[PDB]
CSV table of N, CA and C and ligand atoms in Angstrom, one decimal:
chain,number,residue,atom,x,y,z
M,1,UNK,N,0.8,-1.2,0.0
M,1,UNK,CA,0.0,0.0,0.0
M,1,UNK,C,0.9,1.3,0.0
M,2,UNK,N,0.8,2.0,-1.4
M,2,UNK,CA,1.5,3.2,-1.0
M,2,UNK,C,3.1,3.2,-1.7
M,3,UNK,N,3.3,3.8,-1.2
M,3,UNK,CA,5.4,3.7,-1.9
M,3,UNK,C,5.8,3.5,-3.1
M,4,UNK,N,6.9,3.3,-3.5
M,4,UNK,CA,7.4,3.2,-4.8
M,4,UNK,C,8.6,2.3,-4.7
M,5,UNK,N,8.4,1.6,-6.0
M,5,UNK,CA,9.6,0.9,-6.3
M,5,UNK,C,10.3,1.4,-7.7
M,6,UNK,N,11.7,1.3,-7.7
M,6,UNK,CA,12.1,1.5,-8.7
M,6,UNK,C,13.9,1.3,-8.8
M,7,UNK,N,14.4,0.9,-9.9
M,7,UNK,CA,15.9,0.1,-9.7
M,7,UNK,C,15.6,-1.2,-10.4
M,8,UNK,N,14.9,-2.0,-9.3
M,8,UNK,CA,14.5,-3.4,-9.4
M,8,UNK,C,13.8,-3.8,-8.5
M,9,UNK,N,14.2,-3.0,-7.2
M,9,UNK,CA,13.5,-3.7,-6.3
M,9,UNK,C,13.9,-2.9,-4.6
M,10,UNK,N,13.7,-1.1,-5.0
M,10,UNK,CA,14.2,-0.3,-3.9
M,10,UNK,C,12.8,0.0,-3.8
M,11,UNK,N,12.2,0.2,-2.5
M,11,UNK,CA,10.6,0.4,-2.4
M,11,UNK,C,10.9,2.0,-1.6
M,12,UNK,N,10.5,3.3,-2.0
M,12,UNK,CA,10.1,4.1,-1.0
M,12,UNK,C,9.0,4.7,-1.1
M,13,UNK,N,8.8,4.9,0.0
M,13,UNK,CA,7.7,5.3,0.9
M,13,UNK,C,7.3,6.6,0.4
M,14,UNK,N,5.8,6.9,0.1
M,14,UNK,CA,5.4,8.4,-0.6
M,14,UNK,C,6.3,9.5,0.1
M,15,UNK,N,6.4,11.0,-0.9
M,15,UNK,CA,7.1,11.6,-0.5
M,15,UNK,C,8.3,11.5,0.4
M,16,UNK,N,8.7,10.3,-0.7
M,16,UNK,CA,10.5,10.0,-0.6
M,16,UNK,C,11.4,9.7,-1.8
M,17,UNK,N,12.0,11.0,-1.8
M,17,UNK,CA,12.7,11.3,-2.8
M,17,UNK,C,14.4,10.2,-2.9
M,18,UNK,N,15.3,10.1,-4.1
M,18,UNK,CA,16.1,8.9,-3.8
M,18,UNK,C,16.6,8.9,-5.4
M,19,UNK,N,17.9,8.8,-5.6
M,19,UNK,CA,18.7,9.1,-7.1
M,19,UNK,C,18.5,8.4,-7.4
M,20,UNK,N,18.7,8.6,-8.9
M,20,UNK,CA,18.5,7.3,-10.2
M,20,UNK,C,19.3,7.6,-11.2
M,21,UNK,N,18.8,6.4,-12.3
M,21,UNK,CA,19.5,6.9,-13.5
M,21,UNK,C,18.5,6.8,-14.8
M,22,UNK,N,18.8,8.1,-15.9
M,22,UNK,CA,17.5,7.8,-17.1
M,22,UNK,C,18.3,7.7,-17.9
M,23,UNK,N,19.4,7.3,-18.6
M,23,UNK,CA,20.0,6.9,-19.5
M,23,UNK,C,21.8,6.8,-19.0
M,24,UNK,N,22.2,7.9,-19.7
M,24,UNK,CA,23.7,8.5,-19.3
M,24,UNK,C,23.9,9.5,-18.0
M,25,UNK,N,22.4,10.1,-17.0
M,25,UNK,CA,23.0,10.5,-16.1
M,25,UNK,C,22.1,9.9,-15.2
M,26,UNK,N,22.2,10.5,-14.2
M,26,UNK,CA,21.1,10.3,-12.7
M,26,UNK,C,20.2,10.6,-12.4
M,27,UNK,N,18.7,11.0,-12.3
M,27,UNK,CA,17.3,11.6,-12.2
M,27,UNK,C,17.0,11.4,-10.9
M,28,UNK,N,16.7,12.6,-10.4
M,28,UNK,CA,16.0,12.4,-9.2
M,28,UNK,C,14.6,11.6,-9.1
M,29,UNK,N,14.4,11.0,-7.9
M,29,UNK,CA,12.8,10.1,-8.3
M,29,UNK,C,12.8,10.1,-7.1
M,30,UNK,N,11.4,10.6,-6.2
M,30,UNK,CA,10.7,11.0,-5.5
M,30,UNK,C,9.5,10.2,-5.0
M,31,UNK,N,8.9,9.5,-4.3
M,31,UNK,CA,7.7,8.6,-3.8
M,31,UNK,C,6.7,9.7,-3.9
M,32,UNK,N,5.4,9.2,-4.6
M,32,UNK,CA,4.3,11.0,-4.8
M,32,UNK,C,3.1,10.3,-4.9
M,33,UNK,N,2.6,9.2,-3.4
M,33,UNK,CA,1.3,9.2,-4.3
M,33,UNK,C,1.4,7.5,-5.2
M,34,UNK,N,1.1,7.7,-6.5
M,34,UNK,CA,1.2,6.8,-7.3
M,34,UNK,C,1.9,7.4,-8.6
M,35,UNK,N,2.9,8.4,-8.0
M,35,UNK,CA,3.6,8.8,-9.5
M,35,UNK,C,5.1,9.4,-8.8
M,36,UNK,N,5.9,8.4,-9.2
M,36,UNK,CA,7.3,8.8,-8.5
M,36,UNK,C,7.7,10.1,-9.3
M,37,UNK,N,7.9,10.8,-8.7
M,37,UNK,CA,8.4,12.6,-9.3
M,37,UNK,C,9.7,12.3,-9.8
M,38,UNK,N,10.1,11.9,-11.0
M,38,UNK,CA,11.3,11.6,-11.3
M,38,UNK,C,12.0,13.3,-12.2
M,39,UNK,N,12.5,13.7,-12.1
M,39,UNK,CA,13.2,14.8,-12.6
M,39,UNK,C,14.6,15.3,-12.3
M,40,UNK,N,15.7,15.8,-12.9
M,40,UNK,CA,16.9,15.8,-12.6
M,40,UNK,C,17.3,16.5,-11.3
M,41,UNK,N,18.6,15.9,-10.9
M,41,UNK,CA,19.0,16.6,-9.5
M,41,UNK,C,20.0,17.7,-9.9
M,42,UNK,N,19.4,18.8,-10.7
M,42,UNK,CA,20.1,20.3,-10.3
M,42,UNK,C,19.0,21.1,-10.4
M,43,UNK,N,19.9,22.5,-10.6
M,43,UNK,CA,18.9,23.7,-9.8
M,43,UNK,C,18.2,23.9,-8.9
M,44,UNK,N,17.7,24.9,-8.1
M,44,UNK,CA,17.1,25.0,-7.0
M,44,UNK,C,16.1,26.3,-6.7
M,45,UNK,N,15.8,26.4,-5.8
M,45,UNK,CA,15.0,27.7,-5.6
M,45,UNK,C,15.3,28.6,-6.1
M,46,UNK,N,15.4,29.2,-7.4
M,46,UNK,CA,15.6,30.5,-7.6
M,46,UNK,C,14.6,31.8,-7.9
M,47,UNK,N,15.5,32.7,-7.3
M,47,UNK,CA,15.0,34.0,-7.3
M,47,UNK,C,16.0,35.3,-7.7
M,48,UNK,N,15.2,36.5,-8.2
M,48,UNK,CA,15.5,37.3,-8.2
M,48,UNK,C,16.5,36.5,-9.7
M,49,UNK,N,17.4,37.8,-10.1
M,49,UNK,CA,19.0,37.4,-11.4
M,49,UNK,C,17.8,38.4,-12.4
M,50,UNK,N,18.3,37.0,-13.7
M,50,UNK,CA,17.8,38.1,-15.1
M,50,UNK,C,16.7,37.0,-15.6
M,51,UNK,N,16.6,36.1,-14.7
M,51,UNK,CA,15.2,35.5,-15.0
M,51,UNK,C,13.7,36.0,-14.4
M,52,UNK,N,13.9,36.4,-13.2
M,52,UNK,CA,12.5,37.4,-12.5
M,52,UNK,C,11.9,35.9,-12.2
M,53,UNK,N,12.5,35.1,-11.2
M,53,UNK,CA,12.0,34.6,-10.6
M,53,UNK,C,11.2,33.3,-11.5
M,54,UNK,N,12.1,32.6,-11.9
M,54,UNK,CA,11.7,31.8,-13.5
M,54,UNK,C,13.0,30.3,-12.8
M,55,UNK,N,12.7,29.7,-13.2
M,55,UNK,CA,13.7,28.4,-13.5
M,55,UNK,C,14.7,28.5,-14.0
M,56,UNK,N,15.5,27.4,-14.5
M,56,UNK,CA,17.3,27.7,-15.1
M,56,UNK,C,16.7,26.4,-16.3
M,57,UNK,N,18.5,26.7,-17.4
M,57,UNK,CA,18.4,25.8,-18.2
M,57,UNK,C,19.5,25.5,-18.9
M,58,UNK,N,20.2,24.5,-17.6
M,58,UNK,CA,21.4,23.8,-17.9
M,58,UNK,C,21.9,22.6,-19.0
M,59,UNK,N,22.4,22.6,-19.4
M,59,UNK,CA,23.7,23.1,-18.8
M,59,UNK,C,24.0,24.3,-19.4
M,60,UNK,N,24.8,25.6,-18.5
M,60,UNK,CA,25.1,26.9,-18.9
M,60,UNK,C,26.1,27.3,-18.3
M,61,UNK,N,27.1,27.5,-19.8
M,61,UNK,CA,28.8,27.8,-19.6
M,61,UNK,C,28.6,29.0,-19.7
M,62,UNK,N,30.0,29.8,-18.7
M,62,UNK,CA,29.9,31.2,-18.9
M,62,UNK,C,31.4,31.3,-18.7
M,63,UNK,N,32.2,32.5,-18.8
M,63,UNK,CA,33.6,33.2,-18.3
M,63,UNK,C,34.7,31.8,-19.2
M,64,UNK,N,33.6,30.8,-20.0
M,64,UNK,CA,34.3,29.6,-21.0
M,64,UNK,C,34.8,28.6,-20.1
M,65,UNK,N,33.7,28.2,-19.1
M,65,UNK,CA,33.3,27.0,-18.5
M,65,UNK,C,31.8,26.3,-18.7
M,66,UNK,N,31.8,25.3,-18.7
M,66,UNK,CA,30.3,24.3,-18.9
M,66,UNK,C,29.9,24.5,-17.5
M,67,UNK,N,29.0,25.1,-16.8
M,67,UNK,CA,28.6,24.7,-15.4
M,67,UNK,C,27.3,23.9,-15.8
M,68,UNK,N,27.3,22.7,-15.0
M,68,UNK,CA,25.7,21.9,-15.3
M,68,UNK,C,25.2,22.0,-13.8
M,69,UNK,N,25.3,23.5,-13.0
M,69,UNK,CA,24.3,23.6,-11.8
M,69,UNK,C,24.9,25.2,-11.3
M,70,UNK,N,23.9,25.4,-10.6
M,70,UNK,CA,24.7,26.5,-9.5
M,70,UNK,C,25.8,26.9,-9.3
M,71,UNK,N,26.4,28.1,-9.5
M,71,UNK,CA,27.6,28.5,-9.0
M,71,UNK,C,27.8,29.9,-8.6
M,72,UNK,N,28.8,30.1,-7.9
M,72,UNK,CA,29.2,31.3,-7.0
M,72,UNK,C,30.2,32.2,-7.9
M,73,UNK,N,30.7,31.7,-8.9
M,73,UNK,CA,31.5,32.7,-10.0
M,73,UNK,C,31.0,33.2,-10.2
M,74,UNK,N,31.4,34.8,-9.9
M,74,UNK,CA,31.2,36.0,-9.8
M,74,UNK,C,30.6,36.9,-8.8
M,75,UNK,N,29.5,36.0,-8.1
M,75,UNK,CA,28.6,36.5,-7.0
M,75,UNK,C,29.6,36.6,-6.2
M,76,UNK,N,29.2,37.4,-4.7
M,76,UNK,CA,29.9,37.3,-3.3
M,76,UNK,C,29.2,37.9,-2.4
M,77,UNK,N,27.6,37.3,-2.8
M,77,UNK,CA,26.7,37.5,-1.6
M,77,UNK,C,26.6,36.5,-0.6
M,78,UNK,N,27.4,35.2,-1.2
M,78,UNK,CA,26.7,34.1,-0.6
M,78,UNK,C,26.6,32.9,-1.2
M,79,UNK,N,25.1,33.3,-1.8
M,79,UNK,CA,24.5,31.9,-2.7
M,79,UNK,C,24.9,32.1,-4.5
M,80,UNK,N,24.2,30.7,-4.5
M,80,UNK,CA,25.0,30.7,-5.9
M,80,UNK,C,24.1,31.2,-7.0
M,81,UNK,N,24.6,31.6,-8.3
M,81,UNK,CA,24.1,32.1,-9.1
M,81,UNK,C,23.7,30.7,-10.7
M,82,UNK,N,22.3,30.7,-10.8
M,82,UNK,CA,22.5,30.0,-12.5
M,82,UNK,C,21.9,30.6,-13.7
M,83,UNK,N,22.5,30.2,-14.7
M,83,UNK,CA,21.7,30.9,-15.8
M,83,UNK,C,20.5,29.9,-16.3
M,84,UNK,N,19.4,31.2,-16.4
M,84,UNK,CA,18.0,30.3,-17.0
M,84,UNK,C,17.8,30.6,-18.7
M,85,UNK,N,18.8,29.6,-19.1
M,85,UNK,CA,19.2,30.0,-20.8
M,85,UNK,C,20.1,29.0,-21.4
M,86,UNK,N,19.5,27.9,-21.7
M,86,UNK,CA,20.8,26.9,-22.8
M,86,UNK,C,21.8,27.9,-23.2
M,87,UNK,N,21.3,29.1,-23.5
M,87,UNK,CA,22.7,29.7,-24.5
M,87,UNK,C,23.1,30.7,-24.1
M,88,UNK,N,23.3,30.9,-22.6
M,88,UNK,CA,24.1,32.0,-21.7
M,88,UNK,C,23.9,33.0,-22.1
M,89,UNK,N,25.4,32.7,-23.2
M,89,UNK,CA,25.6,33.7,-24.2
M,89,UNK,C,25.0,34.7,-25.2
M,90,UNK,N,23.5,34.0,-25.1
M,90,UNK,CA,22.5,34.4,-25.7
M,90,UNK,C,21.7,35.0,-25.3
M,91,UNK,N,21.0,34.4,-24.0
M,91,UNK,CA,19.7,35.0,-23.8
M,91,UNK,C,20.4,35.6,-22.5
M,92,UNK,N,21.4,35.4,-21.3
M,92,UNK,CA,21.8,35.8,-20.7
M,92,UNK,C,21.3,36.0,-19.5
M,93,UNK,N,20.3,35.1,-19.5
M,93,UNK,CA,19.2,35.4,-18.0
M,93,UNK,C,20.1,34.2,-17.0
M,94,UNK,N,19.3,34.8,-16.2
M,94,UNK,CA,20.0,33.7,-14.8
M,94,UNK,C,19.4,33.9,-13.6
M,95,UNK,N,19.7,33.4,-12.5
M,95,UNK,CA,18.7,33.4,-11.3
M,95,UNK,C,19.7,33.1,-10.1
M,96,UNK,N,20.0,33.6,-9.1
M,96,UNK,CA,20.1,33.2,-7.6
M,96,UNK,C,19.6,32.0,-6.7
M,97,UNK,N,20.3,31.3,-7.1
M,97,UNK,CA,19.7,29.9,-6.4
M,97,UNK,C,19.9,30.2,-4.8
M,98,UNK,N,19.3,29.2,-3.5
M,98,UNK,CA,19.4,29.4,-2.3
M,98,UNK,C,20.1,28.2,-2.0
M,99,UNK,N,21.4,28.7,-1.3
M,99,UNK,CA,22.0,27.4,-0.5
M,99,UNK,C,22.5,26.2,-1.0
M,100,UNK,N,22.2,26.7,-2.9
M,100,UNK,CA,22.4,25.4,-3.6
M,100,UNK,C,21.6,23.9,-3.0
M,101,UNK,N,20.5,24.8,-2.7
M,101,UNK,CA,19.2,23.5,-1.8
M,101,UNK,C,20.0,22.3,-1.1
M,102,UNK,N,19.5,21.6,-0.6
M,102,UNK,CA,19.9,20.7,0.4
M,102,UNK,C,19.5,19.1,-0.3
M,103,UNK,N,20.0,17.8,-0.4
M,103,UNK,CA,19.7,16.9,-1.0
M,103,UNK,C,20.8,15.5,-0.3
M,104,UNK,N,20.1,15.3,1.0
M,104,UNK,CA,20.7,14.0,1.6
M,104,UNK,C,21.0,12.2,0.9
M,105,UNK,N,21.4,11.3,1.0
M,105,UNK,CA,21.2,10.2,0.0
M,105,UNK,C,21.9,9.2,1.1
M,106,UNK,N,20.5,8.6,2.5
M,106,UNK,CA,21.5,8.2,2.9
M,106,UNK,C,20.9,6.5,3.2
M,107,UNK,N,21.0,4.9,3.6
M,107,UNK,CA,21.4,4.0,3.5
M,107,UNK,C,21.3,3.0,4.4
M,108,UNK,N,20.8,1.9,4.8
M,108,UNK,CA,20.9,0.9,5.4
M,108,UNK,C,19.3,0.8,6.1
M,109,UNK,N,18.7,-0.1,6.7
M,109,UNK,CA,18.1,-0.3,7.8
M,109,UNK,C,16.7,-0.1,7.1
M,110,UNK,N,15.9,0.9,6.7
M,110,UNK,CA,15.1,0.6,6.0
M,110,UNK,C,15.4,1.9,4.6
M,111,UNK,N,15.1,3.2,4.7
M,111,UNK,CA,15.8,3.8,4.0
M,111,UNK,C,16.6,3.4,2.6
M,112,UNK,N,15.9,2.0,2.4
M,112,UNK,CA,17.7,1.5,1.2
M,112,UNK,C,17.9,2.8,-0.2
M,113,UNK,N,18.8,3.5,0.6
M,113,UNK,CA,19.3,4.6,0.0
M,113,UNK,C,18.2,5.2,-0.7
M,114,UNK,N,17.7,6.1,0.3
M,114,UNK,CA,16.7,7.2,0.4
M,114,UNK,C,17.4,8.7,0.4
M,115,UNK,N,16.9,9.6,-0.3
M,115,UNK,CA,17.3,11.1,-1.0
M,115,UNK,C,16.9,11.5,0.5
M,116,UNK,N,17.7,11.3,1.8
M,116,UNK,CA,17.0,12.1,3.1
M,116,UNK,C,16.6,13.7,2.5
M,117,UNK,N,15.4,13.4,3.4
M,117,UNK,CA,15.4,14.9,3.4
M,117,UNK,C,15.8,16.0,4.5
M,118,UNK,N,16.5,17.1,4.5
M,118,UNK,CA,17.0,17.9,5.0
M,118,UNK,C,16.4,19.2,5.1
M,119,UNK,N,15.3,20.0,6.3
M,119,UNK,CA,15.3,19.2,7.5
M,119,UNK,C,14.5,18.3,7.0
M,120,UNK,N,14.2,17.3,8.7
M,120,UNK,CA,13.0,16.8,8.8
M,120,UNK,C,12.6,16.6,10.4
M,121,UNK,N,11.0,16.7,10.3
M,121,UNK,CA,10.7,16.4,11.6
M,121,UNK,C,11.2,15.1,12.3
M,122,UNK,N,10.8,15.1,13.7
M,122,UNK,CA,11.1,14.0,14.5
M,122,UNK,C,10.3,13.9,15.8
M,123,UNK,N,9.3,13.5,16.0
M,123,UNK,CA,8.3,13.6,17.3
M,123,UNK,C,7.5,14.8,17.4
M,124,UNK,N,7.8,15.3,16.6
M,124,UNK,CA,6.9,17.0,16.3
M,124,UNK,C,8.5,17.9,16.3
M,125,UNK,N,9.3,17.4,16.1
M,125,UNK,CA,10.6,18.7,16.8
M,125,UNK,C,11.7,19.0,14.8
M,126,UNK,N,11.4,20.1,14.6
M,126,UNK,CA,12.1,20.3,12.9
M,126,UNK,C,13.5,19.9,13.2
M,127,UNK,N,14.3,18.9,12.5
M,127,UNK,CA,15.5,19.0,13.2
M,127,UNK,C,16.2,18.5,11.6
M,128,UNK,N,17.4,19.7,11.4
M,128,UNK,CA,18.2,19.8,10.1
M,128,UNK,C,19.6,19.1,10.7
M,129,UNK,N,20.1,17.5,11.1
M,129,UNK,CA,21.3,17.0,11.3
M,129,UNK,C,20.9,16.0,11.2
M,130,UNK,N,21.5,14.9,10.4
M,130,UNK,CA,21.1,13.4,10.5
M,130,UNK,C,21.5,13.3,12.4
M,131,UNK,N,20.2,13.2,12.7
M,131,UNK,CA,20.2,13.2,14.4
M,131,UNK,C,20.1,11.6,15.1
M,132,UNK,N,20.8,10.9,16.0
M,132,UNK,CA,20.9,9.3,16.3
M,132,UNK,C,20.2,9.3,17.7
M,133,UNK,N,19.1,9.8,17.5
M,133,UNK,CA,18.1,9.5,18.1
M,133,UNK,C,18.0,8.2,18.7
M,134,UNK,N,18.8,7.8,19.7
M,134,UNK,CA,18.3,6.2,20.0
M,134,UNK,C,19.4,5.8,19.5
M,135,UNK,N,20.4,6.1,19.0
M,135,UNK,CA,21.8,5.5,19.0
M,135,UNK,C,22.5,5.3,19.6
M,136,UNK,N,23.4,6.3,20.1
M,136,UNK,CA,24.7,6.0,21.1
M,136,UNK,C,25.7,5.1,20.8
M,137,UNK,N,25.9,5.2,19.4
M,137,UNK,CA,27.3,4.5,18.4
M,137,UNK,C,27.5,5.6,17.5
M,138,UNK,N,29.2,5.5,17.0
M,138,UNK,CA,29.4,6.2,16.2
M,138,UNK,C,28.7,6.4,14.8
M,139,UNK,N,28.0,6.7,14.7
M,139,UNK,CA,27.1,6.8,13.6
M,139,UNK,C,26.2,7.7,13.3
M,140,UNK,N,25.8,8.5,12.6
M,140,UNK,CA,24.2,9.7,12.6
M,140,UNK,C,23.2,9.0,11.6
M,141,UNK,N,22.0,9.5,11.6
M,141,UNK,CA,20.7,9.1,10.7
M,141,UNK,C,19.2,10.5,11.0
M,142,UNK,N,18.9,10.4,9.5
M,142,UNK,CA,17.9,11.5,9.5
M,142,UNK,C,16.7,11.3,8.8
M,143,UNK,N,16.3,11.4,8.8
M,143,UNK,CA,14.8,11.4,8.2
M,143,UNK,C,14.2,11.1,6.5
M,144,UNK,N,13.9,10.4,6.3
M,144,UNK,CA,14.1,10.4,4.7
M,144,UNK,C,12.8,11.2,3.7
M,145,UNK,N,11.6,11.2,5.0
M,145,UNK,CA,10.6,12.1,5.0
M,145,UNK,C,10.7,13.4,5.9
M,146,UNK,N,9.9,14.7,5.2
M,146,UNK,CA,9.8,15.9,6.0
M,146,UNK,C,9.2,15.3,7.6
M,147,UNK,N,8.4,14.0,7.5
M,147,UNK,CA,7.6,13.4,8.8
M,147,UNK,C,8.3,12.4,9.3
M,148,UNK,N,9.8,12.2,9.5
M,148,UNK,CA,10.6,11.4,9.8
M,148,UNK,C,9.6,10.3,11.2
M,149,UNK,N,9.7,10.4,11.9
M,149,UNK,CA,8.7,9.8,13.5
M,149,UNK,C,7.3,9.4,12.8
M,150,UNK,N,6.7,10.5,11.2
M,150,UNK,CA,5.3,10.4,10.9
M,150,UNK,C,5.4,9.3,10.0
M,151,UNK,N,6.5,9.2,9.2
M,151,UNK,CA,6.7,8.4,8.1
M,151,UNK,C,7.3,6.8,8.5
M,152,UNK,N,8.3,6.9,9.6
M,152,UNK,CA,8.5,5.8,9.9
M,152,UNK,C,10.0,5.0,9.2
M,153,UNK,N,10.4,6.0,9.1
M,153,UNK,CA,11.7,5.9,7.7
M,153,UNK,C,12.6,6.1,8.0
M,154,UNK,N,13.8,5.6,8.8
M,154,UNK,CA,15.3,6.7,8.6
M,154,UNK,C,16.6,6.2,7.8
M,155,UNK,N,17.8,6.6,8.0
M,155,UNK,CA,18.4,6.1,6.7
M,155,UNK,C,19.5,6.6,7.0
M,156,UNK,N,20.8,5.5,7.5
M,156,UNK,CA,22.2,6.8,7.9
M,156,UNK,C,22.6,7.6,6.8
M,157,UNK,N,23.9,8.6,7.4
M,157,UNK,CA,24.1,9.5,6.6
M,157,UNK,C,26.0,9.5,6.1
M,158,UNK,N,26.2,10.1,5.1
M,158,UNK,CA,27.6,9.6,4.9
M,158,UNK,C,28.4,9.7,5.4
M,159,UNK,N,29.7,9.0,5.1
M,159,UNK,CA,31.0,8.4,6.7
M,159,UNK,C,31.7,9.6,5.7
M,160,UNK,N,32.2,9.8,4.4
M,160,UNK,CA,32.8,10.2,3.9
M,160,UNK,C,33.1,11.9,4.8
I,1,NAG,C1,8.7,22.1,11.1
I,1,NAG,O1,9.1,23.1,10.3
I,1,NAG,C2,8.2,23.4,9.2
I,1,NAG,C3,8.8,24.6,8.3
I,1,NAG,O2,10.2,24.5,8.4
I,1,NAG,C4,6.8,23.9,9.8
I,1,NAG,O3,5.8,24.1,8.8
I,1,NAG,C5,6.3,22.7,10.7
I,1,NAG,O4,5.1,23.0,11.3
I,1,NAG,C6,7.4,22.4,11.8
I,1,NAG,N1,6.9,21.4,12.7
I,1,NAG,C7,6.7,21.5,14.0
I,1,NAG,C8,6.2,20.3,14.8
I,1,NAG,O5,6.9,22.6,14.5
């Protein structure tokens, strides 16, 4: 009842996001329901640039580099900057992404390599750290749903 399978045989749980692949690269895929949100993992919230608050359209080289996401060349507010324009060069629009969004990917127990989400609740409490809640071993884990305690789901996070 519910969840998503996809790979061969990785099952997540609605509104649980988790990488893939649709040919030669990786696609994000998402538990939604009965329709895994599958779509790529770049860009992010953007606002404000020379799009007016519009989407991006990578991959977009500038200064005679290929960037295929977000980047901070040139900016020094902070966050990163992308262009919303196949042809940079052309249309020249672009947008302020935030924080270069957040996108966890973590593993074991039931979680089998689930796109954590970052934050996520825990008992009613918002908490942004893969938190070991009930651990007390060297190790962290976070939520793989915004309803981590609601959803029933956690998933460590990387050693690297
Ligand atoms: C957790 O945070 C989100 C927004 O960050 C908020 O909508 C939600 O109500 C919060 N949950 C609790 C239990 O405070």
């Amino acid at each position: 009842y519910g969840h998503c399978v996809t790979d061969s045989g990785v099952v997540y749980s609605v509104g649980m996001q988790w990488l893939k692949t649709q040919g030669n690269k990786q696609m994000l895929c998402t538990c939604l329901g009965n329709g895994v949100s599958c779509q790529e993992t770049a860009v992010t919230q953007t606002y404000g640039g020379n799009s007016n608050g519009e989407p991006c359209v990578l991959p977009f080289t500038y200064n005679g580099r290929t960037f295929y996401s977000c980047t901070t060349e040139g900016r020094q507010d902070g966050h990163l900057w992308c262009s919303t324009t196949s042809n940079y060069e052309q249309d020249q629009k672009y947008s302020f992404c935030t924080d270069h969004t957040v996108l966890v990917q973590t593993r074991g127990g039931n979680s089998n390599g689930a796109l954590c989400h970052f934050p996520f609740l825990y008992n009613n409490h918002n908490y942004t750290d893969c938190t070991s809640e009930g651990r007390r071993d060297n190790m962290k884990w976070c939520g793989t749903t915004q309803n981590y305690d609601a959803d029933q789901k956690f998933g460590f996070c990387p050693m690297a």
